[PDB]
Amino acid sequence: YFQRPENALKRANEFLEVGKKQPALDVLYDVMKSKKHRTWQKIHEPIMLKYLELCVDLRKSHLAKEGLYQYKNICQQVNIKSLEDVVRAYLKMAEEKTEAAKEESLTPWVKFLWESYRQCLDLLRNNSRVERLYHDI
Numbered sequence: 001y002f003q004r005p006e007n008a009l010k011r012a013n014e015f016l017e018v019g020k021k022q023p024a025l026d027v028l029y030d031v032m033k034s035k036k037h038r039t040w041q042k043i044h045e046p047i048m049l050k051y052l053e054l055c056v057d058l059r060k061s062h063l064a065k066e067g068l069y070q071y072k073n074i075c076q077q078v079n080i081k082s083l084e085d086v087v088r089a090y091l092k093m094a095e096e097k098t099e100a101a102k103e104e105s106l107t108p109w110v111k112f113l114w115e116s117y118r119q120c121l122d123l124l125r126n127n128s129r130v131e132r133l134y135h136d137i
Helices: 007-017 021-032 044-057 061-075 081-104 107-124 128-136
Strands: none
Touching (some): 061 081, 081 128
């Protein structure tokens, strides 16, 4: 039922429309950390990136780290760069939340950001294919 894969994201939006944001986030986590994922195309990594992004709004850092790591362990097989791309995505998302909170004003948000940088660095650490992305972060 993965393909067409326009359903997980839709249902996430639906779950948020009813205001059950956390249920929506946890739902996407289930999708991207599913065992069928390795067989699945790198494209889902797009979906995983979106899920990681919602995670940012809810400041659910723990779930985010676990989402990314667990997704990475599954995906090594194919669409490997995808890991670097969702890493980049995560960083750009938290890096924009800092812009928002700073421009509107907050400590937690700085700590959230630090914790995010740290997690991405420990995720990308020591990987030939992730060296450029790691160096960037």
